[PDB]
Structure 1
């Protein structure tokens, strides 16, 4: 199960570069040079890396210091064949964003956040990125009076509309992806799920330029079904990017390696992405636990790609099995794909076999046979077939 750049696996600089600070503990690992991360990831078989502006260029850097951080990075990209398909803005670490970037109560902070964002869009375009992600981690509140949510959504729409106007006036080939999260670090975060972000996008001036960047663990922090949520995104034509990791239920954001946490949900997600032919990057937003040294950091990153490839094999075998294909027919998945009333409204109203003469007791007595189907999926997942 060896990865190749063909598999389009990408990692953020901040993932393998996490030093291990949590709310109760100091760093257990030293800082990584972004040059060494690109090199070690290329040897593992990754396709590319992503960054926040402040991961690559330390906050407060002069214009010359900015120049050589970028130029060393580009040299490592050139030396390895590594791509940069996505980039994003840090609007959550500096104390100035403690009440938000785009929806901070202070007007002057909001304007700053937009200028800080615009500056990095230019850089992402320079480096070849096709997707620009926005994670509004500080947008929200800990108490009810602190934030009028309707005014906040007006400010959030204003910010995204202005960014839309910037990229089209520049002629940039880049699209935006909103990344939802229900809570942490704020008590409640605005646009808390994939659904809320999808609904919000339809009110932007140019909705074609915006999609979603869902994260496995984030929807699971609301106890939601992540494959179900991704299906609704694909059904709406809005899955621009995806963040893969593991999470063990409703609690703090664990960011475990992909495959850890809810293993069956990982299997159903891989099944769905491969079946629908999602062609974007398979991006890992995870943290190697702070119990680990650097050897365990690279072992954990290798594990992300390895688990994806195993699940892909098992899901392909599941769908290719003639016995599963007949069970799907037994469960009437073929009938679900057929229109309910292609004959139209008047014909349905005139169809006595749909009501007056419909035999409800016979239909009710039919088994769905879902449990035999699900055990075939288990058997395939576990390799007992």
Structure 2
């Protein structure tokens, strides 16, 4: 197939730009020029590009340089038609953030971190970004007695309340998306799952401005069901953005191409995002790829891997639609009573009083006869997979 701008495929500058310096070895690729990145991505079908302040402008660039870089970057966008849907801030690389940005034990670091973000907000607003992604990669601990979690949540909240305040006052219209991750680089990161992140956001001052940006690999690092977590995020209406990639369970963060890790779950995820109610997608934001071209690859492998992300999503989309359109699947869905879950448990107007009065719901209920009937889930699963294999 072919990607259109309506597919809304976006990529971070740090994805195709990863030089491949891992925890155990040196970089295997030279630095990627941002203008070239813009050009290369425009060519493969991306509709937008994202970045961390520091991916674009080298940490400690004088005003002249910074200004210089931005203007060249704006031209490239101009020329290519790519947009900047989201921007983020690097609060994890520099040694000053070793104990965190917003929740560093050191108060001076917290103040500095806020300033660094305000500044990226400005650039973001100027480039037309709608979302500010916040990844607290250094928020956490290696040792339990080293971090007061309650105080850290207070400080995290305190910093976000301020960012919302500023954005609203400057009229930036940004939405904020917290990105949860269980560990790496800290032994344990605060807001470890999509769940914890949603619960937190609900405690902010203007909760309507905050949501989450879950990443496939992060939930899988804890062996959780990504599709199921996204289904909950959508239920809450907190899916502000999504990062797609691949992972092979609980181990270091792999950042593989989307669909190169848990293929079955990548299939069900695409199905959930696209085969939304009223035919339409359940999610309309950017389909952002936060992945890394393997260290064994050169620049050709890099563009090949960028294209693979798009091809995987579109191939899966195609099979998810065929799946839902199959009359035999329709028959299996019915036998499994998937849609019966959408009908309220109670009849309209019934409350506990009427439920208590219904002998058929308890006193005369034959639990044994109901318990003997199967749901036909295995057959339904087998049909889904045969659709994925293109065998039907």
The alignment's TM-score, normalised by the length of structure 2, stands at 0.97
Structure 2 counterpart of 1:42: 42
Query: In 2, Cα distance between the equivalents of 1:29 and 1:116?
Result: 28
Aligned runs of 1:1-385 on 2, under 5 Å?
Answer: 1-276=1-276, 277=281, 278-342=283-347, 343-385=350-392
Query: In 2, Cα distance between the equivalents of 1:161 and 1:64?
Result: 32
Query: In 2, Cα distance between the equivalents of 1:374 and 1:232?
Result: 21
What do residues 265-293 of structure 1 show as CA deviations (whole Å, max 9, x unaligned)? 00000000012321100000000011000
Query: In 1, Cα distance between the equivalents of 2:302 and 2:171?
Result: 40
| Structure 1: 5+ residue stretches without partners | none
Deviation, 1:334, is: 1.9
| Structure 2: 5+ residue stretches without partners | none
SS at match of 2:29: coil
Deviation, 1:64, is: 1.0
Query: In 2, Cα distance between the equivalents of 1:258 and 1:205?
Result: 35
Deviation, 1:212, is: 0.3
Deviation, 1:344, is: 2.2
What do residues 157-188 of structure 1 show as CA deviations (whole Å, max 9, x unaligned)? 11111111111111221100000000000000
SS at match of 2:319: helix
SS at match of 1:234: helix
Deviation, 1:191, is: 0.2
Q: Say how many residue pairs are matched.
A: 385
Moved >4 Å (runs of 4+): none
Query: In 2, Cα distance between the equivalents of 1:293 and 1:164?
Result: 41
SS at match of 1:326: helix
